[PDB]
Amino acid sequence: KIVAYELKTGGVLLHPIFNPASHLHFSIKHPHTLSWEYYSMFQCKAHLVMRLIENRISMEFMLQVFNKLLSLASTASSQKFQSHMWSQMLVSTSGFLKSISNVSGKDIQPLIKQWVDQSGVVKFYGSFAFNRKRNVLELEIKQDYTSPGTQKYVGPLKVTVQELDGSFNHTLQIEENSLKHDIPCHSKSRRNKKKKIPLMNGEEVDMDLSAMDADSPLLWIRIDPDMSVLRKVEFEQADFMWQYQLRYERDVVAQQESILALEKFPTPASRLALTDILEQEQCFYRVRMSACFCLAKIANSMVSTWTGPPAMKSLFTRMFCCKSCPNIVKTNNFMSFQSYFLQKTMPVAMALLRDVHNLCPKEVLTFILDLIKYNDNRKNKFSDNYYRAEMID
């Protein structure tokens, strides 16, 4: 939301100094002259910058800062002196930074100078190349700092590389003149023997390594995984790396960004990846709800190649319909709250299917109308208004 708004119009400036922001058509000196979208993005950027301050100075020290502010205010709140002490209930920026420096011993003045006083987000364009001879991974990260909303980042940058030997984090120092970052790569001895490949968490899984390159061990790369800067990343992986990142990652933002990047690769391996995500309980439900729409877009792009039925129809009849009647939907029992959301989002994406003539097929429209006719809600303890409203959608 904030990178869309700041690249759209100028930027949000937390803590201006009194104009400080002249790129935008109102004055930021008073709350009653702000646009309402600017007020909303102001609150949004403020809580993300506080998450960044928690990233630099750990969460228990952050809660100690907040407790110190509240405790000064509550010793202030019981005095009777007319504001000799009632102004300890008012916080400022300098007092907040001083309380942070009191509890932690680190000051955050570079982070405050970059993300508060400066009003911009950063844009990262990354591309890699694997050097087989020296066994290194040559990243190439360049910033677009000449757009109207952007600024230049010179700090450190975390990158997480999943190779066959596991998941390794690397810190890169991205100075102004930097372009190529050579990080080292590990072995490929988990392709010699079939062993399980260890993940970002402690677990390990069986991966189908037939799509991987023979010479490179690395399975996927993520630039800034923890969202530790206010950034927009445009990484150029290979399509099998996006499919491996969709399947076997233990991070929902990486699964979402792989869904978002698989729309450019309409190959049938990506259709298999999104269909395996859709069938998979123990995936987070908002990833499967995105995979519905991604599968609809991919299915629209590979018409005159699609083999069987329309997308997600057989999957809908496998998950939510009767075993004896495929075209009759099961009676509504909405007590699971994840297959309820997936059931009410799957025909909405299924209706975006189009034939070679650019008209929605009469197999999906008939399916949606049979979902509407055979709807029986006399048996669940929950209402049907959102599911029926999504059927109209």
């Binding site: 680190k106 570079p110 010179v154 450190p156 810190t171 100075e175 102004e176």
Partner: protein
């Protein structure tokens, strides 16, 4: 490491001497520390981690000498670094100064290593992220054990 609280002897006091005079405290609590269970790996001699720590320590010292410099083009002297690290060959010190500095022979700043104008000197938290104090303790343990074995 497991520690065990013992009371102090009744005769022993603690004298803190400085340049100005002697100062006396009593002590009442003294722990006995058992066999340590190490959580940090001491590097070996001529290891890759050993040479990496030596290079990073020299680089951190050079950056902090550049931060301490009051001259508007930040400039340091080589024999300050040669006083700090006298066992180092000067080729290694010049390797650390090659990037981030240049030698001025003539004119102003002569016989000084001025900081390059395009080089951004790292901030305090980056210099702290370069070398950790526990790595310095592991290096000191390695070189002390090197001396005792030698």
């Amino acid at each position: 490491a497991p520690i065990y609280l013992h009371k102090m002897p009744e005769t022993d006091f603690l004298i803190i001497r400085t340049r100005q005079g002697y100062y006396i405290r009593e002590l009442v609590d003294i722990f006995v520390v058992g066999q340590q269970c190490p959580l940090f790996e001491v590097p070996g001699p001529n290891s890759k981690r050993a040479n990496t720590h030596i290079r990073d320590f020299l680089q951190v010292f050079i950056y902090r000498l550049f931060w301490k410099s009051k001259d508007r083009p930040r400039r340091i002297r080589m024999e300050d670094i040669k006083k700090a690290f006298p066992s180092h060959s000067e080729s290694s010190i010049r390797k650390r100064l090659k990037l981030c500095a240049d030698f001025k022979r003539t004119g102003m700043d002569s016989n000084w290593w001025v900081l390059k104008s395009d080089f951004r000197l790292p901030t305090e938290e980056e210099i702290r992220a370069m070398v950790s104090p526990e790595q310095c303790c592991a290096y000191y343990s390695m070189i002390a054990a090197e001396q005792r074995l030698k």
